[PDB]
Amino acid sequence: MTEYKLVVVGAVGVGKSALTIQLIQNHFVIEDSYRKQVVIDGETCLLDILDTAGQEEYSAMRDQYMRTGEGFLCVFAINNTKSFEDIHHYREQIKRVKDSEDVPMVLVGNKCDLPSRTVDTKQAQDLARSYGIPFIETSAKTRQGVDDAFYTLVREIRKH
Amino acid sequence: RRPRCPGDDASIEDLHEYWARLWNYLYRVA
Amino acid sequence: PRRPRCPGDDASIEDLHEYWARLWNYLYRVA
Ligand SMILES: Nc1nc2c(ncn2[C@@H]2O[C@H](COP(=O)(O)OP(=O)(O)O)[C@@H](O)[C@H]2O)c(=O)[nH]1
Ligand SMILES: [Ca+2]
Ligand SMILES: [Ca+2]
Ligand SMILES: [Ca+2]
Ligand SMILES: [Ca+2]
Ligand SMILES: [Mg+2]
Numbered sequence: 547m548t549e550y551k552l553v554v555v556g557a558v559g560v561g562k563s564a565l566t567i568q569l570i571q572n573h574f575v576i577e578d579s580y581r582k583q584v585v586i587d588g589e590t591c592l593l594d595i596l597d598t599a600g601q602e603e604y605s606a607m608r609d610q611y612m613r614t615g616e617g618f619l620c621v622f623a624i625n626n627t628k629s630f631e632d633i634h635h636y637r638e639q640i641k642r643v644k645d646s647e648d649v650p651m652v653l654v655g656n657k658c659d660l661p662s663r664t665v666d667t668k669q670a671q672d673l674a675r676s677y678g679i680p681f682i683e684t685s686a687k688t689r690q691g692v693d694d695a696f697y698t699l700v701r702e703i704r705k706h
Numbered sequence: 707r708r709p710r711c712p713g714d715d716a717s718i719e720d721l722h723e724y725w726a727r728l729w730n731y732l733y734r735v736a
Numbered sequence: 737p738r739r740p741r742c743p744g745d746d747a748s749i750e751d752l753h754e755y756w757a758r759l760w761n762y763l764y765r766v767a
Contacts, residue, residue: 549722549767577707580726594726598733605736607753611729614760708752711742718766725759732756735749 550700551614553596555636556621557629561656564686565621566597569696574687586697587704593696612643617699621654622670624663624683633673650702651679654695659685707731737765 554562563576570579580595596615618640622629633653640649653674655667667683674681680698684691709727712720740758743751 577709577727577730579723580730581723592722594722594729596729596733599730600734600736603736608733608736610757611733614729711744713742718763721759721763725756725763728752728756728759732749732753 549592551594551616553615554619555598557632560621560623560629561686566595568686568692586700609643617650617703619654621656623657624655624665625660627664630665652699653681655683658683659688
């Protein structure tokens, strides 16, 4: 697998676009590019990123688009409890589309640079530990853990 | 905001780059 | 391994979807 399809899912305003932009460009503020060549664990690989945008809706095409993805990032905001609440929702949707219980997935806690938090790290770790998926706190603004989140998702795909 | 066609002279890499942008565009216009 | 042809501006969203599906299939087999 020299090529990887990655889909970023999450609530509106959690920073999915900012995470993708801070991966490709890579700076913090764009549909210019969604593709990057990087080296992970001594092996080069190409990454295609689907930055899911807009309200959730029924769509046969969107299902096909997500089904193309091999790995999924579940992003929530630490200052948004409601975004963390919807994590179970995005997970079930992914399992529904991929038609599998074991889908390569990584739980992402974004905006960890903000001093005011509503969801603690432990509460998020316990959720990811029950799913059997890794959990990484990221910050698109300070470019903290951005690469770590996507690269770990690549590891998850390689293990499966 | 629809991505321009890669063209006939486009290489495989150019097609991959286009496909990724088309991937996000098609999802968004649904 | 037939390279698909990119549709024009007159093309609909479905046309782009078709080309999207064909391109993915093409890029997979040539690689
Ligand atoms: N402090 C901070 N702000 C962020 C971060 N990620 C995104 N934002 C802010 O969130 C706003 C909207 O996020 P956006 O990427 O559009 O959310 P999306 O709906 O998932 O695409 C932007 O104006 C960013 O300034 C982060 O890691 N830290
Ligand atoms: Ca619809
Ligand atoms: Ca719609
Ligand atoms: Ca037509
Ligand atoms: Ca047609
Ligand atoms: Mg966005």
